[PDB]
Design a protein around this ligand. Structure first.
Ligand SMILES: Nc1ncnc2c1ncn2[C@@H]1O[C@H](COP(=O)(O)OP(=O)(O)O)[C@@H](O)[C@H]1O
Lengths: 50, 243, 49, 384, 372, 245, 49
């Protein structure tokens, strides 16, 4: 959402965001947790989100 | 509520009543049952205390008083075996209408103000009784509207209109209602609304003897002197033609 | 229900035809009982009347 | 300052009876109303009925344990035993899920399939099994035992691949009451009743009579010396006075039956007569029985005995006379089907019994309380 | 971490503003600009604080954080927010709301004009083409925003009120979640064996009736049923229902041939009934009026004069006599439009005769007034 | 500036309501006085008109004079089963305000459908185009030969251009206030209606003495609506539950 | 009646059923608020011919 708010990246997509975020966690910029606690749709439940 | 009572008293003082009497009402805080609690009178004084004069110390005191009241609510739950949920006990402890009481007062001509207890009321004459009983109610229903805009029609609805007022004095009650300027729907078993103080009025008579499934409406009219029938213009045309 | 609507929209578009209240009741009920009691013939027969 | 049984208490009692339980999160008005009088309700229920009223933070529940179970009592949305089995297995599954835990419909189906205790495995490739599971899940959702994260279970009927995301709600814990011993030591449901009444030895008879009156549509005289009916006969007046005082109902007593009538049934209540067409034929049959007292002379116990053939003949006679006015559902169905449907309906209301051995039909005296007919102008219309 | 003096600073600024407005524009323009600057700097500070805090409270971070120990972290952060921010809001909002109630646009426009003076004094090199009236409107809209924030409006709940109500809702939510954690931890005494035993029992059932019976015994009856009847017609314990008089119902035939309705029904518009009833009632009234008129003598009735009277007139006269003594003026009213005055002499043995009985009573006179 | 021109109530209708079939009571300069032998409806009519049409709340307490729960709105709408052989109806109540000294009319009315002890719908409406029911507007078309009161959709269609139709008491009360009364708040309107209800209670006629006035006024003050206490009671109950656990 | 038949003035003889709603003392005095009395002496007597 924040990426889409900025005019330059307003057209952002989830896939490029995931590529960059995986890249970042490779650099230890972030602490990754797996989202197994709650969901809102079937696919969200099946997804091993973070 | 205090503003409402203040407006009501202002209106009750700002008129002269045909019975040679003037009324005034006040909404005063009561004294608590005993000193075994934070006396509710202190809390009421703090609440009525003007905001400008409020200060952090008074805020702390008010919070303390409310804490005490809630503690009393829990204590009452435990002590009263009725098993009522805490919600009821809170709604009882914090109900402010119990903290205040009304006091009606009347002032005969050039005599000191007095409180209107039942006993004093019975000494009154019929017109005095009617005025005392039906000025506070009408003046209250009129005070409420003053909160309203200028488009509002001052409506009231009286059931068994004025039952109890001695037949002669109902004239004065209608005079009062006329003066305030109410629009109303009143029902009665014997009231005919032929009193000369009523500028204009519409009377409908219902008839269905015991079990008939249809109500028959006989619509009259009034103009202050005489009570004619009503025949509707379109209905006059239809009646002329339908013969 | 839609057919009833169309029939009584056909009447009210033709003001020169005088369908009394009683005949309107007759048509209403005859439509109301389509294919359970009476075929369509009893409706259009009254319109044609 | 003491409480008294008043309009609020009567309303609370009716609400308690006519629902399985009341939930705070969904019925806040009813929950609040019931709780305020909860002291008086507990006292009265304990003294007269003996039912345990369970008042909790999230719900209020009256453990309506019947004196003698009857067909209409059970969960009505279910139509086969397999539905009950799947319902119980689903509950067992929910015991394994923490509150607000989320599980997919496939997991629930798999666990139910694994646990299902029958000799014959539960299989999802069938239509009937999937329909049974959908009915079970619908009843579960009715009691808010499980909430639905968006999806659609109805499609499961025609698409076994359907998927749904469900959430175990807190109420699942409290749904089923507690049982006396290690419940597994018992071998048949009848043994449960012998326990639940082992706690009510004190004035068992009064609680018995009150439960039968309030729960069942009627109370039939077992024989000439039925103790419950003897009790009612001995205390007709005070029973009537107490019941009128404490509830809307008014007692009736006859030689062979006793029941409570209700004058102004509120929305949530079930009553006879009602909209369902089968009642119309029940009223017509009642009138037809009234009309031939010598042919259908009731035996001393108030029963009227007829064989399936005789009942079918009666139904044919009714189809001849009043059939023109029956609902199109029955007008198009053969005699034996009408007999089956009418007998199911009359069973639900304890109007009649099908004799287990001889297939003999027993029409109970309760049927003769009410009779119905078409308006005379239509009947003359039926002549035209 | 917020500052507990936020509302204290804003209150001091508004207090100085009140102090100067009481002096009625008798001071320099720079003072007014500084006062306004302090006031709205602090107000914008508070506005940012409330925006951020309400975002924190609403945070879906909280909503997912309920399911863990992290909620404890959220609880600590939330209680810090309440203890630093909202407590000050509660202590100072009342006085602020009062002061803002005092200060409308009317008490401010001269102060706006002097603010404008100082604004002109500033050598603004910006794109200042907006007229002095534009500066006035900017300041007025700013102050109206402040007034709406605290006092709200007759059509919208103030910002303060919405903030406070959301805070209370969140407090209830958090306490209830702690309750739920207690519930989750305590109760776990699983019943699984009971449920599987129950399923085993149910599958053994032959047919639906047996299964429903078992469900009733196990879970308990899900409802109750009863017969509808309008009255406790019978009272006889000794008669079988068949031999008793049944209760008769009107079965509605389930064919439109007779009647069946789902959409709004029709009524009869029974005007002829009403016409008949009105005419009969008014005829009765007129005839009674005439019967009263029949005895009128020179505009009044004196009982001693009456020779023989209709029983109805006797009853009407007794009604009048009774009613008259109730009213001190001894005036009476009648449905015929006739005011009636009743005077009583009570030393007399006078007989009022009719077809039935001779009533001895004290003499009376009845005057009728001119209803014109 | 001038004063606004005050509204006045001159007309009051019923349509297939109670034993009323099609009646419209006129007001002479905003005043009206029903009368008749007891058991004739002199009370039920007024209860139907006021204060029901002012806010639209129809719960038994509002109709009930004692404040008890004797009769529901359905019972008034359908009438005693022992008298009228019907179990389904659609009734219309409405009042017609007129601006004194001008020829503009605003109507407000309720629409109900009831099936004996089966549940009662309701829809409220307000007409603002200066049409008057019975002169250039109607509620029951003669189509099909009989008279059928309009259903919700038809009423919305005919009114929709000139007025609003709503299906919730809150919206109706806000509309009526906004147009006729113009209170600057909903709370004041609610308290006014509470006082009007109190006036219309019968304790005056019997116990004619001042302490009745104290009870009437004391009952007029608005108490703490359960919502405001709900946060406090819920929170304290949860905290005490935690303590016990 | 029946007071002067026997003389039993207890509330059970006054109330139409026997309740304690109203008592002979108030009947003699008259209700508290309606009158200022607090003491009185009265008589009741029937005459037979
Ligand atoms: N639901 C009901 N239950 C009992 N009586 C009803 C009901 N509805 C209407 N009634 C009738 O309403 C009629 C008029 O009542 P009401 O006008 O309030 O008395 P009054 O005119 O003397 O003030 C009564 O004759 C009563 O029978």
């Amino acid at each position: 959402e924040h990426m889409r708010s900025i005019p330059a990246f307003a057209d952002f997509q989830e896939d490029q965001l995931h590529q960059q975020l995986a890249q970042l966690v490779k650099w230890n910029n972030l602490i990754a947790r797996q989202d197994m606690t709650n969901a809102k749709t079937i696919e969200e439940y099946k997804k091993k989100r973070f | 509520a205090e503003k409402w009572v203040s407006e009501m008293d202002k209106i009750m003082e700002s008129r002269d009543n045909s019975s040679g009497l003037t009324f005034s009402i006040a909404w005063k805080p009561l004294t608590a049952e005993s000193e075994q609690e934070l006396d509710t009178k202190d809390l009421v004084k703090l609440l009525q205390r003007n905001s400008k004069f409020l200060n952090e110390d008074d805020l702390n005191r008010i919070t303390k008083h409310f804490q005490s009241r809630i503690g009393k609510a829990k204590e009452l739950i435990q002590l009263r075996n009725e098993g009522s949920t805490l919600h009821q006990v809170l709604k009882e402890v914090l109900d402010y209408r119990k903290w205040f009481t009304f006091v009606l007062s009347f002032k005969r001509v050039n005599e000191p103000k007095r409180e209107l207890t039942n006993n004093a009321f019975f000494k009154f004459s019929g017109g005095e009784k009617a005025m005392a009983m039906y000025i506070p109610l009408f003046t209250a229903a009129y005070s409420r509207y003053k909160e309203a805009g200028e488009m509002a029609p001052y409506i009231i609805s009286l059931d068994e209109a004025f039952a109890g007022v001695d037949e002669n004095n109902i004239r004065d009650m209608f005079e009062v209602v006329e003066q305030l300027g109410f629009n109303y729907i009143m029902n009665s078993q014997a009231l005919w609304g032929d009193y000369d103080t009523i500028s204009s009025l519409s009377i409908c008579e219902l008839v269905r003897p015991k079990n008939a499934d249809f109500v028959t409406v006989i619509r009259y009219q009034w103009d202050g002197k005489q009570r004619t029938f009503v025949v509707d213009d379109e209905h006059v045309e239809e009646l002329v033609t339908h013969d | 229900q839609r057919l009833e609507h169309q029939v009584f929209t056909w009447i009210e578009q033709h003001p020169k035809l005088i369908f009394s209240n009683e005949r309107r009741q007759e048509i209403a009920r005859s439509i109301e009982g389509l294919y359970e009691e009476n075929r369509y013939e009893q409706v259009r027969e009254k319109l044609l009347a | 300052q003491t409480q008294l049984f008043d309009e609020k208490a009567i309303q609370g009692m009716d609400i308690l009876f006519h629902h399985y339980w009341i939930l705070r999160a969904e019925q806040p008005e009813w929950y609040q109303l019931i709780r305020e009088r909860e002291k008086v309700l507990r006292r009265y229920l304990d003294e007269k009925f003996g039912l345990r009223l369970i008042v909790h933070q999230h719900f209020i529940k009256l453990e309506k344990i019947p004196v003698e179970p009857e067909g209409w009592m059970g969960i009505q949305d279910f139509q086969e035993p397999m539905d009950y089995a799947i319902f119980c297995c689903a509950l067992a599954f929910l015991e394994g899920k923490a509150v607000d835990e989320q599980f997919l419909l496939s997991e629930l189906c798999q666990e139910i399939q694994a646990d299902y205790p029958g000799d014959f495995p539960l299989d999802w490739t069938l239509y009937t099994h999937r329909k049974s599971l959908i009915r079970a899940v619908k009843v579960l959702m009715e009691f808010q035992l499980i909430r639905t994260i968006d999806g659609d279970i109805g499609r499961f009927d025609q698409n076994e691949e359907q998927e749904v995301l469900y959430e175990a709600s807190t109420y699942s814990r409290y749904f089923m009451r507690t049982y006396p011993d290690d419940f597994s030591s018992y071998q048949h449901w009848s043994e449960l009743l012998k326990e639940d009444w082992k706690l009510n030895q004190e004035d068992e008879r009064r609680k018995r009579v009150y439960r039968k009156l309030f729960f069942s549509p009627g109370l039939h005289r077992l024989d000439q010396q039925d103790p419950d009916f003897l009790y009612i006969r001995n205390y007709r007046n005070r029973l009537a006075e107490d019941i009128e005082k404490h509830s809307e109902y008014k007692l009736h007593v006859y030689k062979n039956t006793a029941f409570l009538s209700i004058a102004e049934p509120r929305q949530y209540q079930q009553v006879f007569p009602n909209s369902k067409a089968s009642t119309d034929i029940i009223l017509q049959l009642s009138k037809y029985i009234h009309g031939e007292p010598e042919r259908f002379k009731a035996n001393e116990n108030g029963e009227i005995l007829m064989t399936e053939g005789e009942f079918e003949q009666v139904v044919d006679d009714l189809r001849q006379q009043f059939g023109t006015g029956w609902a199109k559902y029955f007008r198009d169905m053969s005699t034996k089907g009408i007999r089956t449907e009418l007998l199911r309906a009359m069973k639900d209301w304890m109007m009649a019994e099908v004799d287990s051995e001889t297939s003999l039909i027993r029409i109970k005296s309760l049927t003769g309380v009410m009779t119905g007919e078409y308006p005379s102008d239509f009947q003359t219309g039926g002549t035209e | 971490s917020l500052e507990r003096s936020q509302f204290d600073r804003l209150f001091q600024a508004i207090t100085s503003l009140q102090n100067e407005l009481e002096n009625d524009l008798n001071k320099s323009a720079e003072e007014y600009m500084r006062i306004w600057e302090d006031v709205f700097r602090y107000f914008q500070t508070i506005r940012t604080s409330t925006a951020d805090y309400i975002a924190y409270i609403n945070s879906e971070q909280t909503d997912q954080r309920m399911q863990t120990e992290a909620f404890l972290v959220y609880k600590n952060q939330f209680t810090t927010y309440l203890r630093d921010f909202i407590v000050s809001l509660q202590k100072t909002s009342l006085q602020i709301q009062h002061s803002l109630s005092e200060l409308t646009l009317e008490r401010l426009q001269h102060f706006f004009q002097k603010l404008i003076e100082h604004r002109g004094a500033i050598p603004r090199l910006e794109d200042v083409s907006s007229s002095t009236n534009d500066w006035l409107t900017e300041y007025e809209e700013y102050w109206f925003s402040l007034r709406q924030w605290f006092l709200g409006s007759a059509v919208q709940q103030s910002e303060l009120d919405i903030l406070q109500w959301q805070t209370n809702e969140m407090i209830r939510r958090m306490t209830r979640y702690v309750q739920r954690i207690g519930e989750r931890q305590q109760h776990f005494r699983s019943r699984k064996k009971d449920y599987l035993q129950l399923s085993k029992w149910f599958v053994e059932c032959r047919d639906s009736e047996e299964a429903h019976k078992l469900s009733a015994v196990v879970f308990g009856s899900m409802t109750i049923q009863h017969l509808q009847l309008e009255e406790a017609t019978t009272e006889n314990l000794h008669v079988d229902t068949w031999d008793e008089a049944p209760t008769e119902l009107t079965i509605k035939p389930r064919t439109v041939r007779y009647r069946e309705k789902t959409k709004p029904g029709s009524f009869n518009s029974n005007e002829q009934k009403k016409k008949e009833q009105r005419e009969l009632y008014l005829k009765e009234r007129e005839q009674e009026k005439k019967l009263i008129e029949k005895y009128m003598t020179q505009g009044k009735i004196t009982l001693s004069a009456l020779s023989t009277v209709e029983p109805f007139i006797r009853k009407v006269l007794l009604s009048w006599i009774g009613k008259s003594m109730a009213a001190k003026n001894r005036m009476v009213k009648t449905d015929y439009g006739l005011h009636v005055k009743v005077m009583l002499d009570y030393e007399k043995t006078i007989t009022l005769q009719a077809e039935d009985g001779n009533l001895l009573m004290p003499d009376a006179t009845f005057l009728f007034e001119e209803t014109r | 500036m001038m004063t606004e021109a005050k509204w006045v109530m001159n007309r009051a209708g019923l349509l297939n309501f109670w034993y009323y079939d099609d009646e419209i009571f006129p007001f002479s300069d905003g005043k009206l006085l029903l009368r008749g032998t007891n058991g004739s409806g002199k009370s039920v009519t007024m209860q139907s008109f006021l204060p029901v049409l002012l806010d639209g709340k129809k719960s038994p307490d509002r109709l009930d004079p004692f404040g008890s729960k004797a009769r529901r709105m359905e019972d008034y709408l359908l009438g005693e089963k022992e008298v009228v052989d019907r179990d389904e109806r659609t009734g219309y109540l409405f009042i017609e305000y007129k601006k004194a000294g001008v020829e503009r009319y605003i109507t407000t009315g309720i629409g109900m459908q009831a099936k004996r002890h089966k549940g009662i719908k309701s829809w409220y409406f307000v007409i603002t185009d200066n049409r008057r029911i019975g002169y250039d507007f109607e509620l029951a078309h003669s189509q099909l030969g009989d008279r059928v009161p309009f259903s919700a959709k038809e009423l919305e269609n005919r009114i929709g251009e000139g007025g609003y139709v709503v299906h919730t008491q809150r919206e109706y009360m806000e509309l009526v206030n906004k147009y006729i009364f113009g209170f600057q708040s909903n709370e004041a309107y609610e308290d006014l209606i509470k006082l009007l209800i109190q006036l219309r209670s019968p304790k005056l006629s019997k116990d004619f003495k001042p302490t009745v006035i104290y009870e009437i006024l004391e009952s007029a003050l608005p108490p703490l609506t359960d919502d405001e206490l709900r946060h406090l009671s819920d929170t304290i109950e949860s905290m005490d539950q935690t303590q016990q656990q």
